[PDB]
Design a binder for this molecule. Structure first.
Ligand SMILES: [K+]
Ligand SMILES: [K+]
Lengths: 19, 316, 316, 317, 317
């Protein structure tokens, strides 16, 4: 496939995932 | 839009277990009822020695509770606490059933299985599977014995439907309409095809199938966008590949519609098979078609994926 | 770069509903105008009894407001509050039209507007575009005046709309009608009859999602170029490898490295070549490596484009 | 469910390095033992001059500590600090082994060792496993005693290792040696020769990634079943549609609905069927729909499986 | 591991613009130098009237600064502020060059440059590399001295650039010119005419994305090995299954398990084998299982490499 998985359910600069 | 209070009667102090809050009394007066809105439900928490409001509860969650008074109708949960604790904090002050519902939005044994209907359900699942098997087997070249099982399955289906009496009922009706129809060959082929809809009766018994249905209902727009992108790509690349090969003798593609299928099996990376009789320009067009197909499939699908993931975790 | 104040005249206290802030007046006087910059707009909130500034508002959002004075020009939204509260909070103090505008970037004539019962014009235009596409595809069929009349009616409608209207939309509008007027070596004829397909892009003015796709392409041109570069590198490398794996065998499947290019593509994008038997063991190993590397090089750059498309779609 | 105390005995103040906390003594007395639960372990931190509890440690993580007393048994780490700081934060107050253990779930025998003399045994074992796999795949060749000796040496080594050792690893080891002893209807012979391939799974004992894959499969059995169910639904539906599209045309490509199943599969997974010419326009439309729906149905459940694999992989490292 | 101070000399108060911090002087005594470590660099901030330390700076970021003293060696940026502001905060107090450096890791000779006269040299090198690749591809054509002159001009330019310049870049530059001088058993000839393709890797010096890809591969070599291992296991298993499905059938499509190996691959990667008719029902079932397992075993390892590439690409810009 090409999606290879999720996009992270949100990708913003200084996102809460990276916080 | 919500209304915020403006300064200039007397200001009161709130002590949430050491976190001191000071607000105008008019701000607390804005919302009637509620623990802090009226003096009747808050006089117990008064401290005569300190003239302070003492609320020995979670400190970080009082900011949102006060902000509801501050914003005069806007209640948003800050990202510092789980949702479980916030639901408990809001219930303490009794903000109001209508206010809590905003964040909420943020015989007959067949539906409710209770011991004995836990079997009826398994019999229904077995009968649905048996009907599917009979359908597939009777389509075989090697093949009354199938008709008897089919009519037994239909009798069970209609018995369940008539005892029961959205979309489940519609599917149940559709699963038995073609059998009663049999009691231009294009119509016959169409009804024999729509006989396959009995496979969707597993939605009543499969939790994942209902999740998929809800995901489709939620992301109809994204599905339409994906179909539109695919259609545009197919038209463009089929036209390009047809015009890249029209000038050669014994052209592989007779017309642009004849190339449509090819375009599809190149955008979805299914593959067409034989590809030799197409020249260099056709090969370049095919490479571009493959790349654009990967992009146009990877673009909108993750939104539907996200919707399905959310619905799956909400169910469990 | 921004400048911050340094200590050594008098300090003042700011009470944001119980959250006391103490800052040097030199910091407060750094920015002229504004609610806190000048004494005229902040004397109203002064408390003569306690010599304190009272601002009965959202406590957690004042940290960014003070930090803007602290950093002397840097205003960043902390990740603790929704966007709605921050936008309203900054408007309360009137930080400045330029300051708020800078933060915004951190995150007849009836045709263009589909209002005043002009949606009928839009649906007629969409129907004409679809009819033109269908007529083009059907006239490419081998089975075929009747098509020319419909095509020229569509061209008259398109040119009437373009002339009454008078960016990329206008360029597409012009290109959609150039080839018809051109026809009033055969390679140029083939090119113009191919570029006639650009009428499919006329749906951009009416389809919101296709504009999102165009904006995503504009934003991720760099990633698209990187993906094309990676695909070219992989195709060249694996085509050379597979061709040299068959050099020593008679009746070679691939006559030359360029001949293998197409094959590499359908292995890099996992589309499929079809017949694969006359390839030896070394060619099969090279093909497996090509498939894996193509999967890798396709999966590497597509998430960026997917994220851009998702961001644009959910911002729209 | 947890119980929270309600107000009306004496109130005390807690000073976490300047961050003042005020809490009723009844809330503090709810939990016995612990640094703050009993006067024995908290009188040392008393300040006679100010009548205050002084705790010169991390300010932001004390909110969860007090909330544990506030909720009377509910302890969750707020998302403002790393896990390392919060893990050591609890150990200071000694809330209890059971409380800490509950939070943990919120986020000869010379062979099973890593000694210098044990790595050689491991490398010999993995070499023997690889040699057995190679011998299998070579003895299946058309061109072919020499293989039997190598196979019996590998079997002897496997039995010796199993006997020295004496879940699922032992089951795999048993299966890897059963067929050789079995040889000492042709369908049974074919089945045993097929199950001989399970020797490849013995690499799980020596491969860290393979155990991660096994744990991921065990965790996501439900998602795997959902994916299989969706595939089955799609295959049945699209095979039936494509068969009935060619019902009215002579020389039908698909003789029956089951015959089309394979086709449906290699269209849902985008593998590809190959020749497609004798199929009419309706069959092509059904095939396009099948390809799109297969892409969607294979894309839907795999995020959960890959997230589980990511979680297990990062937990291992 | 870090050491935390314990209570029982004098306590001091820190007023970070209204946020009062109270800590033991021993905690401030733990780290020498620094603005707060020694009286010399902090006396200016003392307030004689209030006996307090006043720092008119950011309030939310002082918690990490105090925790460095609190934890005695641990500095973690709390997730409430961007890295830009926190980088300036640590510089204000001058925690120490070693402390700041440790946190950094937590998150003529004109040819190797970019000036007005170096740009033309770079564009010339890129053009020469592209020309060499084109000459290679066209000299492999069946329709064909004229190519040798262009080849030797490219080689002279390559060796001139290498000599002027004088890791991995120099290795690639060397390998790009070894085969030309080698020419001055046909297996070695085939190997050298194959390794001539390495000239295409010289574009790394001029392409920023290619270096990002190389860094991603270096970082995720472990994940690449895991993916290769999973593919090998799946190929062996499914080749064995599909071969033994046709073992008892006459006119078997697959002669041996290695013969089926290729098939397995083009089913795990969903490339497609092509003709599939002569395979029976059991072979088709095995093929469907192989397709599903290949989808799974490809979707599992790739996202880690995807994350590494995204991180490197966004760190570059
Ligand atoms: K594919
Ligand atoms: K394929």
């Amino acid at each position: 496939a090409a999606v290879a998985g999720l996009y992270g359910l949100g990708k913003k600069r200084q996102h809460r995932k990276k916080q």
